[PDB]
């Protein structure tokens, strides 16, 4: 029968989350149901106030990106009681917690082929990073981060049977071009030998971008862990950025919309409780598979 289905983000304040609530929204209606939907505003309590009151409208299927991977617990175990299905996307919900699955992208395995690729393009050179970080406590952020660094270690460990590397700052931009642009510049004060930038999105790294052109800053590599935003794909097209990490925010939309709807409806059980969205470094060599100027995000 009819149900309906809710989507609960936690902010819809970077590019990103913009472009996933559009899609979960046009999913739901596509497969023909009622989508109810909740910005939290990155208000944690809001969040937890959204999810009862999308549970008491009646949904069947939730769909949350959750503000924070513990203080959601409480509720979408309530949630589940009261007999919703529910679906994480994106941001990382405690496991432990009673939901049909998580869909994300592929982090750590993302983070793993930059580093790889890192060091095909600058063999043995010594690295100088300079990270952007988006929110302190961030799990999904320190998966990138860490999945990056640790895969040049392991790539040039791989290569050169040893490994070295120095990050000489980390800031905090919050996920956007703002945050990124305003870390990178005090980073720039601080530092006079970076040769590489380490951003746990695009969005940040773009921001980066225009502060390093602003001082003359030359030799520097743009490294990102996440998302293939298309501005960042532009540049990576014209040889101006170096990679970045497969996290389509449409595509874990309409994957958590199918499946948790098959869910519902029966058509599916024994769900993996983590689904990760297909892995990959987008470099000059490939870029073509995944740009769209025209594209939402
Ligand atoms: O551009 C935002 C994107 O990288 C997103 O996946 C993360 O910010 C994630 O929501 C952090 O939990």
């Known amino acids: 029968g009819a149900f309906k289905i809710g989507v609960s983000m936690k902010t819809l304040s970077a590019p990103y989350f913009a472009a996933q609530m559009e899609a979960a929204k046009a999913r739901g209606k596509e497969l023909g149901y009622e989508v109810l939907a909740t910005d939290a505003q990155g208000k944690l309590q809001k969040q937890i106030s959204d999810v009862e009151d999308l549970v008491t409208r009646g949904v069947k299927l939730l769909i949350i990106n959750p503000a924070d991977s513990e203080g959601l617990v409480n509720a979408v175990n309530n949630a589940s009681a009261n007999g919703v299905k529910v679906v994480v996307i994106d941001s990382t919900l405690n496991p432990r917690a009673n939901f049909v699955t998580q869909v994300q992208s592929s982090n750590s395995i993302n983070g793993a082929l930059v580093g790889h690729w890192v060091i095909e393009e600058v063999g043995n050179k010594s690295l100088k990073i300079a990270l952007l970080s988006g929110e302190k406590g961030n799990p999904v952020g320190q998966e990138r981060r860490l999945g990056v660094l640790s895969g ?11 490994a070295d590397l120095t ?131």
């Open 167 to 297: 990050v000489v700052g980390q800031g905090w931009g919050h996920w956007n071009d703002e945050g990124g642009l305003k870390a990178m510049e005090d980073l720039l004060v601080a530092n006079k030998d970076i040769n590489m930038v380490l951003g746990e999105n695009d969005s940040m790294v773009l921001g980066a971008r225009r502060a390093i052109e602003s001082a003359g800053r030359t030799g520097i590599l743009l490294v990102a862990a996440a998302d293939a935003q298309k501005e960042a794909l532009a540049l990576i097209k014209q040889g101006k950025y170096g990679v970045t990490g497969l996290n389509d925010p449409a595509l874990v939309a309409r994957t958590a919309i199918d499946l948790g709807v098959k869910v519902v409806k029966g058509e599916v059980k024994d769900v993996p409780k983590q689904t990760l969205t297909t892995p990959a470094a987008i470099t000059k060599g490939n870029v073509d598979k995944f740009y769209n100027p025209k594209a939402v995000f």
């Open 152 to 162: 040049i270690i392991e790539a040039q460990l791989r290569k050169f049977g040893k």
